[PDB]
Design a protein around this nucleic acid. Structure first.
Ligand SMILES: [Mg+2]
Ligand SMILES: [Mg+2]
Ligand SMILES: [Mg+2]
Ligand SMILES: [Mg+2]
Ligand SMILES: [Mg+2]
Ligand SMILES: [Mg+2]
Ligand SMILES: [Mg+2]
Ligand SMILES: [Mg+2]
Ligand SMILES: [Mg+2]
Ligand SMILES: [Mg+2]
Ligand SMILES: [Mg+2]
Ligand SMILES: [Mg+2]
Ligand SMILES: [Mg+2]
Ligand SMILES: [Mg+2]
Ligand SMILES: [Mg+2]
Ligand SMILES: [Mg+2]
Ligand SMILES: [Mg+2]
Ligand SMILES: [Mg+2]
Ligand SMILES: [Mg+2]
Ligand SMILES: [Mg+2]
Ligand SMILES: [Mg+2]
Ligand SMILES: [Mg+2]
Ligand SMILES: [Mg+2]
Lengths: 50, 71, 79, 76, 64
RNA sequence: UUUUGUAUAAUGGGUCAGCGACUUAUAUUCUGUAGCAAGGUUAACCGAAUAGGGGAGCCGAAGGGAAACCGAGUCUUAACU
RNA sequence: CUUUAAUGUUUGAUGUUCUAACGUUGACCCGUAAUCCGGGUUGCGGACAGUGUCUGGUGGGUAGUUUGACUGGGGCGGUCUCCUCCUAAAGAGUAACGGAGGAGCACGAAGGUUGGCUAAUCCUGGUCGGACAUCAGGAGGUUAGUGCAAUGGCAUAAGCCAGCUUGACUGCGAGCGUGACGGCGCGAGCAGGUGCGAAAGCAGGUCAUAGUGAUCCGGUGGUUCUGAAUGGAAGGGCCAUC
């Protein structure tokens, strides 16, 4: 198991996060995706964090 | 906390209904601090609920029977 | 390893430390192969074979980080 | 020996045969590949499961240019 | 003497209106990254003890 | 008696007579029966003491929710066809 | 303020010396008529030794215990969960220390959509070029390919290429399949927001079936839900998660 668990924090200022996995060797870049925030009910860009 | 049946309001006293007037009628325990009057039975006498937390549905029954509710 | 002093003494300290680690690794290999030669033996009756000794041998594979990097050869192709 | 292991049975196969009066959303057949295909008023899940899309009798047919077995539901 | 209740089994079951018991689904404590949200979301509400295990719980809770 | 299975060469008993093994509190659930019935019933205790008092309490007539809380509805949910 | 320097200055360490605590299984006297004990003069060690509490190490000297199951007797060897095929007797299911193989992952594109395309192998000709490299046209009709075993499937392609994106969304869910249960799986549709497409529509991960671990105990972030006289807080509870 070379993939490690990472969490996609929400940039909307609220405390909400998804959780996925990422091979930090092949992809050392920082993920960002437009996902849904149930707290705000809007699509906001999520950036990865520990 | 306890629940007061509507039909229990005919067994209390000459009409005033507070916490103490119910503990005299043995309807609630001696350590009860709050109570509620829910729509469960049927009320005929014009009862005056002094301080309690009657529900919306039971409030209409008390007034329709001739009573009045306060805090 | 915070070392107090100058470069000249720390160099000798590092060399002595490396020599000690080499000796300890060699001793560990000796012990590993001896316990392996014991493991490969038979049972010789309705005897124990020592499950505790088996577990203690299996624990003895804690792995070693080779010093690595330590570049000492480079390739300049002929012209 | 070296072998001697298996895997639990998966209990596939047709569940509602021909002529069954089924309810909406009821599973009609579980399968691994696509043995039967989805016809009218039926669907196909990710497992290639065929489920009723509306209640009614099941009908099996071999329509198609490649002679493929289809499952459809009458509105009865 | 009074029947002792199984204190451990009184922290996981509540007696509902008719006489059944309700409990909390398992498999939702940790390792929550693999699990699909559809599977997780179905585990969030409470459930009812099945008829097979009802006889076993009634014995454990004589008073509740 | 124990077993798939015993005339079994599998176990036990020499024979008579006497003794010898599912009991007794408490608590809980279900059935039958009796009394009262949206009510039923007292405990300790008092008592000329199996009567009569004592209603402290316990169960039941309202449930939902983890809880605050709401209440013939309640919880989930931004809200539910 | 900035680098130090000196005497006072509390202490900290270190060593030397002393006696008064302490030791005396050194001598002498008394109780006494007694190599016990006590008391008294003295000598010698002396704040060391020794004892109490706390603490690190050693400790089969001693004590309590554990040391799995299957098994063509036990031990030795082998196995223990999950996936695919046969045994399996044309619904499901079905055992053996029966016959053959795999898993404990991968992917930020290898997912979603909108366009587009169709393989293996052989023949003939053609620079270094050949039995087989790229090119041209004929046969061939999926004998080809799939992220990794086997089976089922795939041309409307599930196989190959490109553009744009994040539905690898949140709350639910009619109704079914499968389990003794814990549980596992499939699912149209409803509400909020989103991507692609002119639109009809498709999208709640990957062609499907392996890629996994209940509870307890804790950790991290949010939430007035509670907060033991009241106002807070601690600790709990709920959601996400390790
Ligand atoms: Mg009372
Ligand atoms: Mg949790
Ligand atoms: Mg026998
Ligand atoms: Mg015979
Ligand atoms: Mg004989
Ligand atoms: Mg005999
Ligand atoms: Mg015998
Ligand atoms: Mg005999
Ligand atoms: Mg009496
Ligand atoms: Mg209730
Ligand atoms: Mg001696
Ligand atoms: Mg011992
Ligand atoms: Mg013991
Ligand atoms: Mg055994
Ligand atoms: Mg054997
Ligand atoms: Mg079969
Ligand atoms: Mg059978
Ligand atoms: Mg793919
Ligand atoms: Mg296409
Ligand atoms: Mg694709
Ligand atoms: Mg696949
Ligand atoms: Mg307080
Ligand atoms: Mg907290």
């Amino acid at each position: 198991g070379i993939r490690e668990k990472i969490k996609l924090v929400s940039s909307a200022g609220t405390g909400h996060f998804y959780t996925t996995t990422k091979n930090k060797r092949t992809k050392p870049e920082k993920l960002e995706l437009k996902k849904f925030d149930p707290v705000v009910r809007q699509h906001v860009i999520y950036k990865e964090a520990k | 906390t306890a629940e007061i049946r509507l039909s229990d309001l005919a067994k209390v006293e000459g009409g005033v209904v507070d916490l103490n007037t119910l503990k005299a009628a043995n309807i609630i325990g001696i350590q009860i601090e709050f109570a509620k009057v829910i729509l469960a039975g049927e009320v005929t006498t014009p009862v005056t609920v002094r301080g309690l937390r009657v529900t919306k549905g039971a409030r209409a029954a008390i007034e329709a029977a001739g009573g009045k509710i306060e805090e | 390893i915070p070392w107090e002093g100058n470069y000249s003494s720390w160099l000798e300290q590092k060399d002595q430390r490396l020599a000690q680690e080499a000796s300890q690794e060699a001793a560990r290999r000796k012990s590993i192969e001896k316990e392996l030669e014991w493991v490969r033996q038979g049972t010789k009756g309705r005897q124990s074979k020592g499950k505790a000794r088996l577990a203690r041998f299996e624990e003895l594979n804690s792995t070693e980080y080779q010093k690595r990097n330590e570049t000492n050869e480079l390739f300049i192709p002929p012209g | 020996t070296r072998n001697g292991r298996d895997s639990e049975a998966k209990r596939l196969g047709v569940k509602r045969f021909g002529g069954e009066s089924v309810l909406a959303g009821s599973i009609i057949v579980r399968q691994r590949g696509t043995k039967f295909h989805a016809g009218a008023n039926v669907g196909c899940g990710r497992d290639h499961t065929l489920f009723a899309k509306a209640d009614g009798k099941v009908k099996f047919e071999v329509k198609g240019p490649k002679n493929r077995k289809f499952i459809s539901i009458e509105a009865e | 003497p009074k029947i002792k209740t199984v204190r451990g089994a009184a922290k996981r079951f509540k007696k509902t209106g008719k006489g059944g018991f309700k409990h909390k689904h398992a498999n939702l404590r940790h390792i929550l990254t693999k699990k699909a949200t559809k599977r997780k979301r179905h585990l969030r509400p409470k459930a009812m003890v099945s008829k097979g295990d009802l006889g076993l719980v009634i014995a454990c809770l004589p008073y509740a």
